[PDB]
Amino acid sequence: YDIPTMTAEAVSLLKSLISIPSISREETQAADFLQNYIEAEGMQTGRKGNNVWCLSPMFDKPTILLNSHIDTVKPVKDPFTPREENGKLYGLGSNDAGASVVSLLQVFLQLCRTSQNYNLIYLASCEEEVSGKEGIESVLPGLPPVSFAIVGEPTEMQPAIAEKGLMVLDVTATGKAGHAARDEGDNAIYKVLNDIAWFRDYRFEKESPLLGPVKMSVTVINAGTQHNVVPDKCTFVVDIRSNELYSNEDLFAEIRKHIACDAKARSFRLNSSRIDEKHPFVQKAVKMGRIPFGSPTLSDQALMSFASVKIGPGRSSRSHTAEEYIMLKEIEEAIGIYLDLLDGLKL
Amino acid sequence: YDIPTMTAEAVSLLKSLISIPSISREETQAADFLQNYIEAEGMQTGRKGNNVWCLSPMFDLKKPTILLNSHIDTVKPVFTPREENGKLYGLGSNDAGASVVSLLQVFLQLCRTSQNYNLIYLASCEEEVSGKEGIESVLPGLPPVSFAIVGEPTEMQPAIAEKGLMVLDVTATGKAGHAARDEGDNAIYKVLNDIAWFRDYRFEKESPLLGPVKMSVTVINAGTQHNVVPDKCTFVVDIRSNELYSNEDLFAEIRKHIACDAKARSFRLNSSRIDEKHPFVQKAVKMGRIPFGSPTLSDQALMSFASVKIGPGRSSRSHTAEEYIMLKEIEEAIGIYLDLLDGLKL
Ligand SMILES: [Cl-]
Ligand SMILES: [Cl-]
Ligand SMILES: [Cl-]
Ligand SMILES: [Cl-]
Ligand SMILES: [Cl-]
Ligand SMILES: [Cl-]
DSSP states (O other): OOHHHHHHHHHHHHHHHHHSOOBTTOOHHHHHHHHHHHHTTTOOOEEETTEEEEEOSSOOOOEEEEEEEOOBOOOOOOSSOOEEETTEEEOTTIIIIIHHHHHHHHHHHHHTTSOOSSEEEEEEEOOTTTTOTTSGGGTTTTSOOOSEEEEOOOSTTOOEEEEOOOEEEEEEEEOBOOBTTSSOOBOTTGGGHHHHHHHHHOOOSOOBTTTBSOEEEEEEEEEOSSTTBOOOEEEEEEEEEOOTTOOHHHHHHHHHTTOOSEEEESOSOOOOEEOOTTSHHHHHHHHTTOOOEEEOSOOGGGGOOSOEEEOOSSOGGGTTSTTOEEEHHHHHHHHHHHHHHHTTOOO | OOHHHHHHHHHHHHHHHHTSOOBTTOOHHHHHHHHHHHHHTTOOEEEETTEEEEEOSSOOTTSOEEEEEEEOOBOOOOOOOEEOSSEEESTTIIIIIHHHHHHHHHHHHHTTSOOSSEEEEEEEOOGGGTOTTTHHHHGGGSOOOSEEEEEEEBTTOOEEEEOOOEEEEEEEEOBOOBTTSSOOBOTTGGGHHHHHHHHHOOOSOOBTTTBSOEEEEEEEEEOSSTTBOOSEEEEEEEEEOOTTOOHHHHHHHHHHHOOSEEEESOSOSOOEEOOTTSHHHHHHHHTTOOOEEEOSOOGGGGOOSOEEEEESSBGGGTTSTTOEEEHHHHHHHHHHHHHHHTTOOO
């Protein structure tokens, strides 16, 4: 396989992508450029919103989905004009997750000219950064059944075989009005003090070797208006991160048995992910010296019910950061590693 | 003394004052009128801002001085005086024009008699908002005050104790970071034990007149987005002392228990007290008056010397729609004030 030519082409397509603003929900022009780029490779695409896909020829055999996102986080030097400096390509969305988008497509295109035991689907999803309803969630029900998926996010090409989920809970304590200088009222602030300590100290029974215990964090609180008015109402927000041993639904039910104050989940759908260690892909990865781990960062894996693994070029620490960059050498390395894992893989 | 004549003159001045709008900080015209009135009575006045005072004749520093005080400002309407059912309506009639007019008549009469003490009459402004241009601006400039009488609606019963006010802002400081990672320092978790402490602690000294120091945590705020560990959390504490502590005494104890940066908006609105064995108090009790403790702030809070709060009307009427004062209340006040002060061996 011609790695240097795939790398040189992946890098030019990424410069184009960095130059096109593609913040969550305002990704139309980037999606245009992507679709029109693939079309020029003799491939017939599919589209829904700013989500673009491409099925392999002669399908339906197990199917492997190759996926990453084209939306970016808002900025914050340089704007989004690409710049190269002694091996580094600077740009918003270069590390998270552009580098993965350009590598997987080059790999998809090369593998479409080889004889494999599986069908292959490429997907450039949108609204990943805000967990948006018109992202990946809107496309899965139309595509053919997915047997296995690779999600491209920066993991220094290490296989993330477990990923924490996300659930946000709004809790409200209702007290009673009064004069603070008198013997009147029910203080809504006092009512939530034990609740907050419980959120910080409670440990769910099942603990994961890869993600440790379920994590819960009280990160926003509000109550009261002026100093001589009894606070009637108090609201707080809990950010909850399941391990792969629990659903968001299992956690909410447990929590409602210990907390008396009204509590509501904003959603239950962004669950944790898991893939069995004997899975053929995990097994070939390990035989190639890769070290499987568990990721604390949410991705498009959370909207996938089928088995998946998170593995892509770049590093976590550069994401959502000033002067974000990807190394030309990391893209070269990613393409070659992706090719070795997939070529001759039997599910 | 001619009590009926004094009463008609006091009631006549009260009408003229009600008609002049004097919302806190905007009492210039009401103070102009009042200054002129006092000058026309043949008394030389003193003035600073909208505070008007005058001193008894032959004032000497070898005798003790009693200060008579009330305020000319009023709260915003909830001003044309009407009379109906032996009762005078208008903004500032109960709180506190009725004391203003009564104390002035009492002052002008005692100034023509021989007493063991000197007198100062003071009409202060900005009381309702405890403003800096009010009584706080005047006191350091006057001669020494042995004790003062503050005229507020107490039904001519003496308030010998008054609560103070202190507001505290406490801030916990942490460190930001990602909530799903092993990062940051949560500023909200830092304040949990503190808030329980403010609600459960009881100061050692309780008053029979005001009960114990009261503290309440009434406002809390922290955080912005769910995935970011909060690095700041601020809350507010409303604290009302009894007469057995200054606000600084309360702050020093609080700081021994709370590590988080805590800052008072001010210490200056302290509790007040006058000893039960003070001669004025003993005279009142002898006349069948019943001393009590008031939970309501007044200009007493800015006086470091001993004081008693006693005036015509009832506090239930203050700050209310259709404010009034019974004419019989001005008449009674004048006579009670004169039985108390006339011949008092200070
Ligand atoms: Cl997501
Ligand atoms: Cl109040
Ligand atoms: Cl952060
Ligand atoms: Cl998040
Ligand atoms: Cl201060
Ligand atoms: Cl005393």
